Ligand binder design. Sequence first.
Ligand SMILES: FC(F)(F)c1cc(-n2ccnn2)ccc1Cl
Ligand SMILES: *[C@@H]1O[C@H](CO)[C@@H](O)[C@H](O)[C@H]1NC(C)=O
Length: 351
Amino acid sequence: EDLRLHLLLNTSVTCNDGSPAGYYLKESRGSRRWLLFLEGGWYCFNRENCDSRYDTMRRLMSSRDWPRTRTGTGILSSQPEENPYWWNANMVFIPYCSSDVWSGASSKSEKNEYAFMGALIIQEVVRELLGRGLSGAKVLLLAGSSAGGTGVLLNVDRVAEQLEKLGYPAIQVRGLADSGWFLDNKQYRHDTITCAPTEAIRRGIRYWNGVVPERCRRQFQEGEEWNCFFGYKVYPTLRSPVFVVQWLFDEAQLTVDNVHPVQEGLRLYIQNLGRELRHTLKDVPASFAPACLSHEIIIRSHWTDVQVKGTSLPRALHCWDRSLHTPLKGCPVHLVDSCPWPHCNPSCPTG
Ligand SMILES: FC(F)(F)c1cc(-n2ccnn2)ccc1Cl
Ligand SMILES: *[C@@H]1O[C@H](CO)[C@@H](O)[C@H](O)[C@H]1NC(C)=O
């Protein structure tokens, strides 16, 4: 259990129920690389569906029952056999306890039953880590899976601005967004369960006092900031380098699309979803998008097994690092499958 819990010293920065937020840390004294990982786990967007989440997903809304340690897995592992990419880095796991896709800036108060502080949690973790060795870093990689991957897209440029304003312009801030690149597409068939993500995010932003990156906000303007939660719309507005990992047939995407022998209508729907996803990645130079039906990858212990065009994700990330020192021979960073059906790639996770 190699990462140790630290609750935030600023106890005004809280989980949904007012308990302090926090982070799990494993330092690597001989390293100037820092990996800050944002946990996922959907979201809630009104009193009734947040109350239900508090009953059966309470660790996603409160720190009162968190364990003192967590084991680092996948990209958070310190063993080179499990993590060829960054096994020697300083490792930070930030639990998701704000239910706001890491976008909120609202406290619990006489008018708010819950606090939605995801964007402030990230900034306060960064602030407190500067005193624990981050001040010496060369690279800060903000990574995340699922809602945490969307959280990377929403917060990577604000972390860069924070460090510049605090006096640390030499720390290179980068993002790694895993399974958080969603499409606001037409559902296959069309309350909490009946609310499409565009409408649920629109309501969430108001409930959370949600915030989005500045350039994206200026493009879409008031009332339309929900657009910035969709990767293909927010990514072109970002200045920090961001590596995008996305299954072409993501299970959470299919869930919001109301998809579960496949006949022609659904066959064409699935094939068109894969084609649309591949199209949105055409101009993303650092990306890894295998043709599999799955969800999340980078903190799985067997994350090294999947390959696109014969290149694994830890290798692609290493090639990305090299590229950030014109292309590299045999060290690709843009890896998007072209085959049109789940598991047409033989290295897909077996389940
Ligand atoms: F696809 C959606 F629904 F749009 C989407 C899905 C999530 N999600 C799923 C699991 N964890 N977070 C978050 C934001 C968005 Cl935008
Ligand atoms: C604590 O965090 C709050 C909320 O982000 C911030 O406004 C304030 O500057 C911090 N206060 C203290 C006492 O650290």
